[PDB]
Each structure stands twice: as C-alpha cells, then as structure tokens.
Amino acid sequence: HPDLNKLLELWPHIQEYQDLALKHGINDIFQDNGGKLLQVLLITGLTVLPGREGNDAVDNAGQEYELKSINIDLTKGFSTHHHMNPVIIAKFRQVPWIFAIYRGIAIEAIYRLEPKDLEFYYDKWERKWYSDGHKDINNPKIPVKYVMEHGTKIYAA
Amino acid sequence: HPDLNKLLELWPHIQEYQDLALKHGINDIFQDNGGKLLQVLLITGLTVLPGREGNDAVDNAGQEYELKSINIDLTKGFSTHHHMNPVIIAKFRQVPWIFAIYRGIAIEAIYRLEPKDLEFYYDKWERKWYSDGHKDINNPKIPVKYVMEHGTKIYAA
C-alpha cells in the first residue's frame, strides 16, 4: 500500500496545520476553502469576522476588509455578492478589499484595492439594477486583470 | 515650577502608551476612556470593532463580545444601550459580555458573563417595553453585584 503509507506519516503536519487553523477561527481546513483562507490570514495578520457580519475580516487597529479569492486555474473573475443590490454596494464601498489569487491551493499573490479603486464597478453595478428597472444582480464579477491593474500587491509567492 | 517639571519628563511614557494604543485602534487615549479601554484590550487579547458594529470586540478566533465598563468610584450600574429595544436585545443575547471594573482609572477586575448569564435581564427588559405598551428603554443598568455573582472573573488587580 504505497501511497497509503504517506498517509499515517504525513498526517502529523496536516493536523498541526488544522490546530493553527483553529487558533484562527477556522474549524475545518477541509471545508469552504478554510485551508486557503488560513494562508491569507497568516500572511496579512487579519482576524476573521463571524459569518453574520457584512465584512469578513479586521486588523489589529479595527479596520475591516472584504475578503475575496479565486483559483486562477479555473476562473478569472472574483465573486462579490449573491443577490447584489445598492445597499450591499453601499456597505461595500466603505472598506478596502483584499484579493487572494491562488493556482489550485497555492497562494500566488494578494492584492489590496482601496475603496476608491472599486468606484468603477460600484457605479456600473448600480446602473444594472436601476436601468434594469429594479432587481438584484446575481454575483457580478471583478476581473483579476482589473485587480492587478489597480491594486497594490501586498504579497507574492 | 515643581509639578510642571514632572511634565516634560513624564511625557515620554504617556506618548509611548499612546503609541501602544494606536497599534490597537485607539486614536486618543485621552478621549472616551481610551486609556482605560487599552487596559482591557491588552489584558484580554481582544481587538476592537468599528463603532458602527453592533458588538464592540472580537478575539483571534472570530468570537465577538460586548464590552461594558464602569468606575465604581462613582457608579454601581453598567450602561447597556440607549434607545434599548427588543431587536437590540436580540443581537445582545448572542454574545458573551466582558465587564471591566475600575477604581478611577485603575482596572480592578474583569468579569465575563456568558449569554445565558444575562437571560434574566433580557427577559425583564422585554416586559418594560411591551407591558410598557411599546417604547424604548433608555439605558437600563446591570448591577455590578449581579455581574460578580454570575460571571467568571478573568482578571483581578
């Protein structure tokens, strides 16, 4: 049982990583990309916010952030919000966003966009709601290209 | 100028303390009791949440807390919420509360009440709203005695 052997021996680290993840509010590294999210948290120094919170993270000085991420091996657009409306927008434009770019599970880069750097999309998204008559927008996307063009890279592999 | 001398020489520390306070999201130790609040933050390991947030703090694992405090040299009841209503209550009973007890500016003790430990007051407060017909409650208080009787002391001077 070749591959299997790497299992009872590689498992000490996986567990340690999970221990690390728990100290950071992540109960299961193997669900909802928790293992990738820990990467971002340890690199940036952020603390995750309860899922019920509008934003997803905050630093040691009380500044909050939206946290988006993608695996470029399968997509090129960042998810934003399901049932996206102008109130959601309104809460969004108040905080900086940090974008995590992975290749599979590997963190390749992290970008930070200031509130103004997203002004373009917030405006666009509003039109598609009101000119649209009225009606949510189901998760419009933010192009990795745009993020790279306007953000400041705070991390690279 | 006797006392004045203690000023150009005691000022190196006060400033350092303020430097410490800034690293913790507190812009001015001399306003809104920021100097006392830093005490609590450093003792407990908490991070403050933006004032717009319902709760006031969160730990490294994403658990949030309400943060109340008093100087027993002048009062014996903990403030809760102005324009207190049942929705406010509803958000409140979901998180633990940590109470800071000071003598003047000195931190004397800190207590933590679990959500259930406040069940008594939440229920009482509801009656005074509905039996009251309907109408907010302007900041009812929580007795230090009660806090000491039901909380677990996480710190003492």
Coordinates of C-alpha atoms in Angstrom, one line a residue, chain B residues 30-128:
Chain B
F30 CA -7.4 60.9 26.5
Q31 CA -10.9 60.7 24.9
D32 CA -13.9 58.4 25.6
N33 CA -11.9 56.5 28.1
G34 CA -9.5 55.2 25.5
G35 CA -6.7 54.9 28.1
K36 CA -8.9 52.5 30.2
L37 CA -10.1 50.5 27.2
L38 CA -6.5 49.8 26.1
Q39 CA -6.0 48.2 29.6
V40 CA -8.9 45.8 28.9
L41 CA -7.7 45.1 25.4
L42 CA -4.2 44.2 26.5
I43 CA -5.3 42.0 29.4
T44 CA -7.8 40.0 27.3
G45 CA -6.2 39.9 23.9
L46 CA -9.2 41.4 22.2
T47 CA -9.5 43.6 19.1
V48 CA -11.9 46.4 18.9
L49 CA -14.6 46.6 16.3
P50 CA -15.5 49.7 14.3
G51 CA -18.0 51.8 16.2
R52 CA -20.7 51.1 13.6
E53 CA -20.6 47.5 14.6
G54 CA -23.3 46.1 16.9
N55 CA -20.7 44.4 19.1
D56 CA -17.5 46.1 20.3
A57 CA -14.8 43.4 20.2
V58 CA -13.7 40.1 18.8
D59 CA -10.9 37.5 19.6
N60 CA -8.5 35.8 17.4
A61 CA -11.0 33.0 16.7
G62 CA -13.8 35.3 15.4
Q63 CA -15.9 35.3 18.6
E64 CA -17.4 38.6 19.3
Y65 CA -18.1 40.3 22.6
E66 CA -20.0 43.3 24.1
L67 CA -17.7 45.5 26.2
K68 CA -19.1 47.4 29.2
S69 CA -17.2 49.2 31.9
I70 CA -17.6 51.5 35.0
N71 CA -15.6 53.3 37.6
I72 CA -17.0 52.1 40.9
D73 CA -15.8 55.3 42.5
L74 CA -18.9 57.0 41.0
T75 CA -21.4 54.4 39.9
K76 CA -22.6 50.8 40.5
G77 CA -24.6 50.0 37.4
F78 CA -23.3 49.0 33.9
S79 CA -24.7 51.0 30.9
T80 CA -26.1 48.8 28.2
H81 CA -27.8 50.6 25.3
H82 CA -29.5 54.0 24.7
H83 CA -32.9 53.6 23.0
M84 CA -32.8 49.9 24.1
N85 CA -35.4 47.8 22.3
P86 CA -36.1 44.0 21.8
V87 CA -34.1 43.9 18.5
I88 CA -31.0 45.3 20.3
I89 CA -31.7 42.8 23.0
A90 CA -31.9 40.1 20.4
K91 CA -28.5 40.9 19.0
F92 CA -27.1 41.2 22.5
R93 CA -28.1 37.8 23.8
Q94 CA -26.0 36.1 21.2
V95 CA -22.6 37.1 22.5
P96 CA -20.7 37.0 25.9
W97 CA -20.2 40.3 27.7
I98 CA -17.0 41.3 29.4
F99 CA -17.2 43.8 32.2
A100 CA -14.4 46.0 33.3
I101 CA -14.5 47.3 36.9
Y102 CA -12.2 50.3 37.6
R103 CA -11.5 52.5 40.7
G104 CA -11.0 55.8 39.0
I105 CA -8.7 54.8 36.1
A106 CA -7.2 51.7 37.7
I107 CA -8.6 48.4 36.3
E108 CA -9.6 46.4 39.5
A109 CA -11.3 43.4 37.8
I110 CA -12.8 42.0 34.7
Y111 CA -15.7 39.6 34.5
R112 CA -17.1 37.6 31.7
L113 CA -20.8 36.7 31.5
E114 CA -22.0 34.1 29.1
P115 CA -25.1 34.7 27.0
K116 CA -27.2 32.7 29.4
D117 CA -25.9 34.6 32.4
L118 CA -27.8 37.7 31.2
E119 CA -31.1 35.9 30.3
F120 CA -32.6 37.4 33.5
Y121 CA -32.2 41.0 32.4
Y122 CA -33.1 40.4 28.8
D123 CA -36.4 39.0 29.9
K124 CA -37.0 41.8 32.4
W125 CA -36.2 44.4 29.8
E126 CA -38.7 43.0 27.4
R127 CA -41.6 43.3 29.8
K128 CA -40.7 47.0 30.4

